[PDB]
Structure formats: C-alpha cells, structure tokens
Amino acid sequence: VRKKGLAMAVADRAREGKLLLVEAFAGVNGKTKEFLAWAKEAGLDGSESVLL
Amino acid sequence: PKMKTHKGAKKRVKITASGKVVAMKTGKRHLNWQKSGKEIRQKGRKFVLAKPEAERIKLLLPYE
Amino acid sequence: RVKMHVKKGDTVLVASGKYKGRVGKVKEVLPKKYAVIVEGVNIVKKAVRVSPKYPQGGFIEKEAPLHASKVRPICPACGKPTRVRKKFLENGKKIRVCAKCGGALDT
RNA sequence: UAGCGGGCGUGGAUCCCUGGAUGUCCGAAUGGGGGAACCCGGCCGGCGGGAACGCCGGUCACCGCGCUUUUUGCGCGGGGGGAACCUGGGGAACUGAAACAUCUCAGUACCCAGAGGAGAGGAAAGAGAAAUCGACUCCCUGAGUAGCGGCGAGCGAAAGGGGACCAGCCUAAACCGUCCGGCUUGUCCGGGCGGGGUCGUGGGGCCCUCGGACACCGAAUCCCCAGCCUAGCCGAAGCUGUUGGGAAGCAGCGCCAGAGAGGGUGAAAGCCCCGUAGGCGAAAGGUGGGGGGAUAGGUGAGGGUACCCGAGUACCCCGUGGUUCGUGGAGCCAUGGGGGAAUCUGGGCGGACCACCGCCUAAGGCUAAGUACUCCGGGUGACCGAUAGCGCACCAGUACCGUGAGGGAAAGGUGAAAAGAACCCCGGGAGGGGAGUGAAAUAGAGCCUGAAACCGUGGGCUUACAAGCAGUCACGGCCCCGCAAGGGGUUGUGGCGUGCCUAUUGAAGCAUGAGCCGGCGACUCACGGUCGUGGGCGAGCUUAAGCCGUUGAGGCGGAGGCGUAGGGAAACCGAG
Numbered sequence: 001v002r003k004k005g006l007a008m009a010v011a012d013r014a015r016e017g018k019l020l021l022v023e024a025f026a027g028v029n030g031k032t033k034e035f036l037a038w039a040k041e042a043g044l045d046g047s048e049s050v051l052l
Numbered sequence: 053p054k055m056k057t058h059k060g061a062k063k064r065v066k067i068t069a070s071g072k073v074v075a076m077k078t079g080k081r082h083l084n085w086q087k088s089g090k091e092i093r094q095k096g097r098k099f100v101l102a103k104p105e106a107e108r109i110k111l112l113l114p115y116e
Numbered sequence: 117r118v119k120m121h122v123k124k125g126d127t128v129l130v131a132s133g134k135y136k137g138r139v140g141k142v143k144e145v146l147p148k149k150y151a152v153i154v155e156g157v158n159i160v161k162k163a164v165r166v167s168p169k170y171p172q173g174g175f176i177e178k179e180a181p182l183h184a185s186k187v188r189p190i191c192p193a194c195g196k197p198t199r200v201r202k203k204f205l206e207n208g209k210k211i212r213v214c215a216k217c218g219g220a221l222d223t
Numbered sequence: 224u225a226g227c228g229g230g231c232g233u234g235g236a237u238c239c240c241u242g243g244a245u246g247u248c249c250g251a252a253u254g255g256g257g258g259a260a261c262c263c264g265g266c267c268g269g270c271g272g273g274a275a276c277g278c279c280g281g282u283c284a285c286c287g288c289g290c291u292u293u294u295u296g297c298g299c300g301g302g303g304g305g306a307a308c309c310u311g312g313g314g315a316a317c318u319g320a321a322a323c324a325u326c327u328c329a330g331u332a333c334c335c336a337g338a339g340g341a342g343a344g345g346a347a348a349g350a351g352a353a354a355u356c357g358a359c360u361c362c363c364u365g366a367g368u369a370g371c372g373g374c375g376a377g378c379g380a381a382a383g384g385g386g387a388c389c390a391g392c393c394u395a396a397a398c399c400g401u402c403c404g405g406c407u408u409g410u411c412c413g414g415g416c417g418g419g420g421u422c423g424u425g426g427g428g429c430c431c432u433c434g435g436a437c438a439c440c441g442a443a444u445c446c447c448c449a450g451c452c453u454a455g456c457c458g459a460a461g462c463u464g465u466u467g468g469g470a471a472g473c474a475g476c477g478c479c480a481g482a483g484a485g486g487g488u489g490a491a492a493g494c495c496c497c498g499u500a501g502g503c504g505a506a507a508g509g510u511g512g513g514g515g516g517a518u519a520g521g522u523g524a525g526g527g528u529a530c531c532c533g534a535g536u537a538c539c540c541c542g543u544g545g546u547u548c549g550u551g552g553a554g555c556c557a558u559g560g561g562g563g564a565a566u567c568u569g570g571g572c573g574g575a576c577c578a579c580c581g582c583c584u585a586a587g588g589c590u591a592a593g594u595a596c597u598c599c600g601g602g603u604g605a606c607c608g609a610u611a612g613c614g615c616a617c618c619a620g621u622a623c624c625g626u627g628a629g630g631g632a633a634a635g636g637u638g639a640a641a642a643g644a645a646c647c648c649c650g651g652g653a654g655g656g657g658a659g660u661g662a663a664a665u666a667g668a669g670c671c672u673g674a675a676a677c678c679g680u681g682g683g684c685u686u687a688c689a690a691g692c693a694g695u696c697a698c699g700g701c702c703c704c705g706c707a708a709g710g711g712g713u714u715g716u717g718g719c720g721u722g723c724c725u726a727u728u729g730a731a732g733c734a735u736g737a738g739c740c741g742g743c744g745a746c747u748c749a750c751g752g753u754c755g756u757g758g759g760c761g762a763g764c765u766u767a768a769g770c771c772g773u774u775g776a777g778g779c780g781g782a783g784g785c786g787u788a789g790g791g792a793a794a795c796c797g798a799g
Contacts, residue, residue, distance in 0.1 A: 001759040002778095032480045055751050056367055060374075112752065113367075116619065117239040117454065124497080133469055134491060134639085148238095150487090150496070151640090162645030162659070173660080177646055183639075185488040185496035197494080200457075212460095 017049075057112050067111065073104030118120050119148040121184060122198060126219045130154060132186040140187055153181040155178060 011020055022042065027034030067073040078096040083091075123145055130140040134157070141155035157180035167173055188195030189211055194210035207215045217223050 003757070030481065031483095036480095053750055054367055056377080056379085059367090059371085059379095063374080066792095079242090085613075119238075131495065138472095150424095156640085157640080159642045159660075160645095161642070164645060170645095177642080180642075181640080183488070183496090188495065192463085195495085196461075197459095197496095202457085 055112060057114060058110050059103070061107065062116070063108070065107070065111075066086065067108055067116070071108065073100055073108050075100045085098055121145070121150065123184060123187065125217055128154075128187050128190045128218070130156065130186060131188045131195060132156075132182075134182075136184075140190075143187070146186075148180060150184040151181050152184045152187060153179060154187065155179050157182050176195065189218055191216055 020043070025035070025038065027038045065073065065075050077095050080091075081094040084086045123143065125143050126147050128140050128143055130136075132138070138156060144153045146153055159180060160175060161171055161177045163174045163176065165172070167195075171210050172174075177187050189198045191211040191212045191214050193211065197220050198211055198218070199213075200207060200209040203223075206223060208223045211218060
C-alpha cells in the first residue's frame with residue numbers, strides 16, 4: 001500500500017508537470033542568493049513551496 | 053487483556069469447522085438396565101444449534 | 117545574569133512612537149526592567165501643598181522614564197544596530213561599518 | 224518596596240560561576256537531661272582584680288568490626304532521612320462464583336527492616352530429545368498456549384525462536400612452610416598466616432615423566448588528556464512619507480540569510496529590543512576507560528599412586544510454601560521435626576518408581592551491561608486557562624475544623640507607562656460635584672470585559688361588580704414607529720385550555736424532585752472478538768520487539784499470527 005502511496009502521490013505530481021531533477025545545483029556552497037538567482041533561473045518565482 | 057477461552061466447553065464440545073456447533077448426547081450414565089439397545093445406539097452422539105451461536109462465540113480466539 | 121542591554125548613558129536618538137524622532141539626550145539607564153529616562157516623558161503630578169519642598173505652588177513634574185526598546189544607536193549618521201569588536205585589547209563598539217562607539221573619550 | 228538617609232565604582236563595584244569562611248539553639252542529638260529549640264555538668268585551657276559569680280574554644284552516649292600484656296586504651300565505620308523504583312520478613316477484607324467455606328480477589332493493598340543508583344539476580348546436580356544449546360536481568364512471539372478447578376467462577380506458565388546486552392571469577396579441602404595453643408612430648412589435636420587448586424573426554428595433590436620456555440594475553444584497579452556541567456563571548460540586513468492616541472499595518476524603493484524559531488517593542492517587524500543558525504569558552508570545582516601508559520593477574524602434554532573436592536547436608540518420613548500443579552500417578556526447588564551418606568561405578572535430574580541412555584558436579588562466595596522508576600535539570604504537546612488546571616496562578620499545606628491523628632478553603636488582569644487625580648466646593652469624615660491627566664476615567668484604584676437571575680427610578684398601555692397552569696383565536700379601545708402596505712406593542716370582550724420531569728395498568732393529583740439564575744456535570748477508552756464497511760492484496764496477507772534515520776521525516780527489520788482438509792477424543796485415515 002504505502003509503497004504505491006509515495007509512487008501514486010509523487011507520480012501524480014508528475015501528472016501536473018511541476019517537477020524536475022537537476023543534474024547538479026549551481027549554488028555550490030549553500031548560500032541563499034546562490035540558490036535564489038539559481039531558482040529564478042530554474043523556473044522558480046516565490047509563490048510556490050518546495051518539497052525541494 | 054486477551055479474553056480467556058472458556059477451558060470447559062472447549063474441553064467438552066465440537067463444532068464442524070464450517071460453523072455448526074454439534075455436541076454430545078447425555079441422559080446416558082446411570083440408566084442402562086431396564087432400557088434397551090434402541091437408547092444405546094441413539095445415545096452415541098448429538099447435534100444442536102441456534103444458542104450454540106452464543107456458544108460458537110464462547111469458544112472464541114482459536115474458534116475451533 | 118545578562119540583565120545586560122546595549123545602551124550606555126551618553127547620547128542617542130529615539131525612534132519611538134510617543135514623540136517619535138525626538139532628539140534623545142544623556143539617557144540615564146534605569147534599570148534592569150528594560151527602560152530609560154532620556155529627557156522625554158514630560159507630564160505633571162498633582163503633588164499636594166507640601167509646605168517645605170512645595171510651598172504654595174504644587175503642580176509640577178519634568179522628565180519621567182520610558183521603555184528601553186524605544187531608542188537606537190548614534191554616530192556620525194543614524195541608528196542601525198551596533199557592532200562590537202575586541203580591539204585586541206579593549207572592547208570598542210563601532211557602528212554599522214560607520215566608525216566609533218558613539219561614546220568615545222579614547223575608544 | 225516607597226520615603227528618610229549615606230555610600231560605591233572603567234585603582235573595573237552590584238550581578239552571575241567556584242572554593243573555602245563565619246556557621247549560635249533545636250533535630251539520629253550523641254555528656255546527663257528534658258514537656259523540642261530549655262536546664263544543669265565534669266576534666267584540658269583562657270578573661271574579667273577573679274579563690275566563690277560567668278563566658279569563650281577543647282573534650283564526653285551507644286553498637287559493630289580490627290588491633291593493644293587482661294591493663295592505659297588506639298583504630299575505621301556505624302546510627303538519620305528518601306516521592307517513585309528495590310529485595311526479603313508478616314499478611315488482610317470487600318468481590319467474583321448471581322448463596323457460599325474449596326478457590327478468587329493476591330502474596331495485592333498494608334506493617335517492619337535494610338540495601339543502591341540501581342538493585343535483585345547471576346556461571347549450571349542447568350535447559351530437554353536431537354549425539355541441542357550453553358551465566359544474569361530486558362523486549363518480543365511462543366499462547367490465554369501447556370496446565371489448574373464444588374473439572375463452576377475463574378486462574379493460568381516454560382522450552383524453541385526473533386533481538387537488547389555481553390563477563391568473567393574469589394575460595395575451601397587435597398599438600399606444604401611458618402608463628403600460637405594446649406597436651407595423656409608427641410614422627411600430636413585445634414588455631415592464625417603464606418603457598419597450593421577450582422572441576423566433566425573429571426579436576427588437581429605428591430613424586431616421577433615430556434623441555435620448559437623470551438613471551439602472549441592484561442582487569443572490576445592506578446593515573447592522566449580530548450570532552451562533559453556548574454557563569455558567559457560574539458554574531459547577519461532601512462529609510463522616507465501616510466491615516467491613527469499609538470504603527471510593526473498603507474504606498475515607493477532597498478536589504479540579511481547556515482539565521483522567515485519565539486517573545487516583546489503603546490497593536491500585526493526577517494533589517495526596532497531580547498534574541499535564532501553558526502562559531503569559541505574554565506582560572507577553581509565536579510564528571511568521564513573515549514584513547515593510552517601502568518597494574519592485579521591468566522596459558523602445556525604424560526604414568527602411577529590411590530590423597531581431597533564443600534555434613535546435621537543430600538537422602539527416607541512427617542507437617543509443607545512456590546510452580547501449570549486446589550495433593551492428583553505428583554515431579555523439582557525451598558524447610559520445621561525426627562531417622563541420618565559418600566567423596567567419581569561417588570551424587571542429583573530427565574514428572575511416582577525399577578531397567579537402558581543422556582544432562583550436569585551440589586550443599587561458601589563477587590559481577591558491570593541492557594531492566595525499573597520519577598524528589599529533580601532542561602526539552603516538547605491535534606494539554607487547561609482562575610468552578611479548568613497539581614490541593615496550592617496572588618505569602619498554600621496559610622485560613623480555619625477538632626485536644627487529637629488528621630481535614631482542607633478562598634483569593635488573578637487599570638494603563639504604553641502612575642501621568643495613579645493637586646486646587647475650589649458641600650461635607651465630621653466618608654464620598655462626591657468641578658477642574659486637571661491620558662487615546663480614553665463606561666480604564667478611577669481589588670478599576671479591561673460587566674451578562675443572567677436581581678433590586679430600583681421615568682415613561683407608554685392596562686387595572687378599584689370581579690372566579691385566575693395566567694395563555695391562546697378574533698374583534699374593538701389605545702399609544703408609538705410607517706410613504707404605501709404594514710409593524711411593534713398593549714389589553715377592552717368572548718369561544719377554547721387538568722404545569723414540567725420522574726414514577727406508573729393509570730396523575731391536576733392531596734405521590735415527588737424542584738425558589739429563582741450563572742456556571743461544573745454522566746455512554747469514553749485499553750485488549751480481543753465479532754458482523755457489516757472503505758480500500759492495497761491475491762492463494763496469498765501482514766510484521767512484533769527493535770534497528771537505521773529524523774527534529775512533527777521516514778524507511779528497514781518475516782520471528783510470528785492469518786489462509787489453503789478436514790474427519791476420529793486418540794493412534795491416526797485422508798476428500799474422505
């Protein structure tokens with residue numbers, strides 16, 4: 001059951017289209033504006049919350 | 053905690069593993085003398101049901 | 117332990133709410149209940165006819181205290197939270213990159 | 224926590240951290256006391272001039288264990304408390320059985336005592352069916368199974384396996400060396416002390432034999448250092464205007480981030496104050512195998528002899544607790560009496576007992592670890608907001624109850640901040656009328672809110688020929704809202720009418736609960752079953768303890784229960 005759970009849920013997100021697995025994150029030191037400009041570039045904005 | 057199977061009726065009854073509680077015939081102990089074989093071969097087994105639904109319950113946990 | 121605040125009895129502005137943007141004076145730290153008596157809360161008490169210290173005229177007050185979270189630093193600029201450094205020897209607290217503790221006299 | 228009043232610090236006070244210090248009188252009280260916190264006293268020593276009065280510091284009750292020539296005595300400890308957890312020493316009744324004695328409740332509450340962070344326990348006369356494992360406590364399944372019983376109520380375990388955890392040993396006795404005792408001197412009986420050994424194809428002793436060896440391992444012990452706690456240190460980014468009493472809220476631009484946890488800042492801030500992530504920190508003290516030095520200390524093969532291996536015991540009986548065992552064919556452990564072994568063909572067990580085969584070496588001892596709990600430190604919650612919450616939110620084990628053991632309350636909020644109301648006025652004051660204060664005094668001092676029952680004062684309608692579970696339907700009088708239409712209200716008349724709840728064959732009942740109101744207050748859950756149901760699954764399902772991770776983050780762990788064959792009570796026969 002719960003196996004499929006994740007699957008279904010996660011895969012259902014995929015049905016919408018809101019998803020991606022970047023090869024490697026450009027902001028390599030863990031600092032805010034790195035990932036921030038990175039996100040503005042990676043299809044992000046601000047009003048959308050991230051099981052990231 | 054875990055309900056206790058009634059050791060007694062457990063130690064003294066049958067129910068065919070389909071759900072039909074079928075028991076053992078009595079009135080057979082201190083008689084026999086002026087009686088006949090008719091009562092003998094009849095006093096060999098028994099039946100029952102309906103309230104042995106409540107008795108089917110009393111068996112409980114291992115059902116049996 | 118660490119009743120310690122950040123305000124020193126010298127001179128500092130007041131970004132309050134009562135008389136907002138009022139020039140804050142010598143300040144007088146009082147006490148450990150986060151408060152200050154700058155030169156501000158001006159009212160008047162209904163003191164009695166108390167013949168000695170209050171002759172035939174009794175209806176007067178000057179500067180009453182106030183809250184300590186109502187002021188901000190001062191330097192050749194404005195407030196902005198103070199940064200402290202160990203000077204190697206002493207312990208000067210220069211302002212937001214803008215220099216000098218705001219109290220001075222060899223620090 | 225105010226006034227009076229006087230001091231102290233950048234020669235770094237207060238404040239927090241540590242160590243010591245002064246530490247009176249009570250209290251195990253401990254010199255003797257004694258009705259607790261009071262009254263006396265002895266010896267060492269001192270001060271007042273101090274031999275009589277008095278103080279100061281010293282010293283003293285008892286038990287045990289270990290020494291001292293009995294002696295003079297020296298020595299270390301003891302004794303008290305403690306909420307829960309803890310081991311033993313005694314041991315209830317109510318109840319269930321729809322009575323009630325067997326039984327149960329339960330060896331449970333409760334009394335004693337002691338032990339410590341632990342304990343308790345603990346290295347095998349084991350466990351039990353196979354030539355199987357191998358101290359202890361803990362979690363799980365085994366399983367309500369195996370057992371138990373006026374075979375009623377009901378009570379009710381162990382192996383196996385899946386994990387936590389890991390730990391092993393001190394001895395006596397064989398033999399030997401010494402000091403002591405005594406004695407029927409003697410190739411001696413008992414004692415203190417060192418060597419000696421520790422058991423399952425037995426272990427050593429003693430002599431003889433193999434070759435016994437640098438080493439090889441190494442504590443529960445010694446000591447130290449990383450750390451850990453008792454205080455801290457620092458630490459990211461903003462303004463202008465705007466309504467408002469007050470902005471943090473309204474717009475304009477800008478900003479920190481490993482930190483947009485939270486509280487507070489006159490309200491609602493990531494850049495106001497306190498802080499959050501991160502990063503350092505002990506001079507003195509306490510705590511720690513984490514790492515190591517070190518230390519106590521541990522290891523061989525063989526022949527013979529014929530030495531010892533735990534004595535008022537095991538073993539039989541009797542009276543028996545515990546365990547599934549309520550005495551049954553009744554085992555094993557433990558023990559009160561009586562009978563009373565041996566030292567390995569010795570002993571105990573394999574559920575009465577005898578035969579065959581296996582298990583393990585008794586009657587002396589110490590053991591960390593995981594267990595258990597909450598006086599307590601911090602941390603959290605689909606926990607509560609002054610009838611709730613702990614009994615105790617505020618000086619609650621205070622009031623006050625009773626000699627007494629013991630009972631057991633009530634009682635919170637002004638504001639951002641006291642600015643907590645001078646001066647006039649009436650008044651003895653009290654309290655108010657003004658003023659003055661703040662945003663506001665409908666926040667005015669047990670003062671945010673202020674209801675209900677509730678007692679007043681004004682007004683509208685109605686009432687002084689009238690028969691009432693108090694209203695209802697209609698109509699008129701009326702007064703006031705209304706553009707209309709209508710609406711509130713009120714009752715002048717007349718048709719209709721035996722309160723509520725409980726209880727009852729059945730109530731207006733002259734059966735009862737109830738004065739009125741505010742509030743508190745009763746069908747839940749924990750295990751398992753059982754029918755129906757929503758879904759994943761499919762002859763398949765699903766893990767339990769736990770472990771890995773987490774900081775509201777999940778996955779992993781197949782022991783096991785479920786399901787396919789039942790039928791005979793059984794051996795067992797098998798879709799029969």
